[PDB]
Design an enzyme around this catalytic site. Structure first.
Site, PDB file in Angstrom:
ATOM      1  N   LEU A  28       0.905  -1.121   0.138  1.00 26.92           N
ATOM      2  CA  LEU A  28       0.083   0.074   0.086  1.00 26.92           C
ATOM      3  C   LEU A  28       0.885   1.105   0.079  1.00 26.92           C
ATOM      4  CD1 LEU A  28      -2.810   1.281   0.056  1.00 26.92           C
ATOM      5  CD2 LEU A  28      -2.551   1.081   2.868  1.00 26.92           C
ATOM      6  N   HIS A  29       1.993   1.346   0.865  1.00 25.93           N
ATOM      7  CA  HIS A  29       2.953   2.388   0.795  1.00 25.93           C
ATOM      8  C   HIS A  29       3.431   2.415  -0.641  1.00 25.93           C
ATOM      9  CE1 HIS A  29       6.341   4.829   1.526  1.00 25.93           C
ATOM     10  NE2 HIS A  29       7.277   3.664   1.479  1.00 25.93           N
ATOM     11  N   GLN A  30       3.827   1.474  -1.013  1.00 29.85           N
ATOM     12  CA  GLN A  30       4.205   1.603  -2.589  1.00 29.85           C
ATOM     13  C   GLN A  30       3.349   2.027  -3.504  1.00 29.85           C
ATOM     14  OE1 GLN A  30       6.171  -2.220  -3.612  1.00 29.85           O
ATOM     15  NE2 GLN A  30       7.722  -2.211  -1.874  1.00 29.85           N
TER      16      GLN A  30
END
Length: 187
Positions: A28-30
């Site tokens: 999700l961060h990527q």
RNA sequence: CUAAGAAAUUCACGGCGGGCUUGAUGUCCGCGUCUACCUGAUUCACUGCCGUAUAGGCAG
């Protein structure tokens, strides 16, 4: 935001929920670095403050086109058989609001000693007398364990869901879906 | 309300003198140890930045 998507971990024989939670948070961060912007925030609906558990749900908050873009991107490739999706749907009303901010700590006194060496040209004994061992802070917070791609370290990202507020204020989010001012509807 | 109730063993001391234990000796035939496994439980509380700060934040 007014639209939300609830992502629940399927139970797996081979993996605990915390491991899959961390991998989902990392991808999700990527995805948020790949998208950019400060308009997308997350929440954890089945959080347990008593046992410091994040549960098995992640609720991402954004616009409808952002959620439908994030459904069909390769950040969920390889994770689709560990997860089950709902639909991007409108938040029910009324709901209290709370902040989702990362809480860092001075858990390594030796790192702060090295910082004092770098900033004040002191010695080891000067830093150890100036910084004793009692400044370390252990957190009663649930956490996800990520690995960085820029540096080669693994770090526990501790999360604290803030107090319930009856209304939301303007604020952006980081590329981790976390509050840098913004608020998400808690339900 | 106890075979209840009570109590100073203690002062001193030279154990040493001497000595050949020895000859001899076949341990030894024989043997199926197999079967089947998640080491992973968040288990790497890290690295650095702003700040005079250890106060407090931030980045991955």
């Amino acid at each position: 935001m007014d639209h939300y998507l609830d992502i629940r971990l399927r139970p797996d024989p081979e993996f605990p929920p915390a491991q899959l939670m961390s991998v989902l948070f990392g991808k999700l961060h990527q995805a948020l670095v790949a998208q950019g912007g400060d308009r997308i925030g997350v929440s954890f609906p089945d959080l347990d403050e008593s046992r410091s558990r994040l549960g098995e749900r992640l609720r991402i908050h954004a616009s409808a086109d952002d959620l439908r873009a994030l459904l069909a991107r390769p950040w969920l490739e390889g994770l689709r058989d560990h997860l089950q999706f709902g639909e991007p749907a409108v938040v029910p009303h009324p709901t209290p609001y709370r902040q989702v901010s990362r809480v860092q700590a001075k858990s390594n006194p030796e790192r702060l000693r090295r910082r004092l060496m770098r900033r004040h040209d002191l010695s080891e004994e000067e830093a150890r007398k100036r910084i004793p061992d009692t400044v370390a802070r252990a957190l009663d917070l649930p956490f996800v364990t990520l690995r960085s791609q820029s540096t080669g370290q693994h770090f526990r990202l501790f999360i604290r869901h803030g107090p319930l507020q009856v209304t939301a204020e303007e604020g952006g989010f980081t590329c981790y879906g976390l509050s840098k001012g913004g608020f998400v509807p808690w339900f």
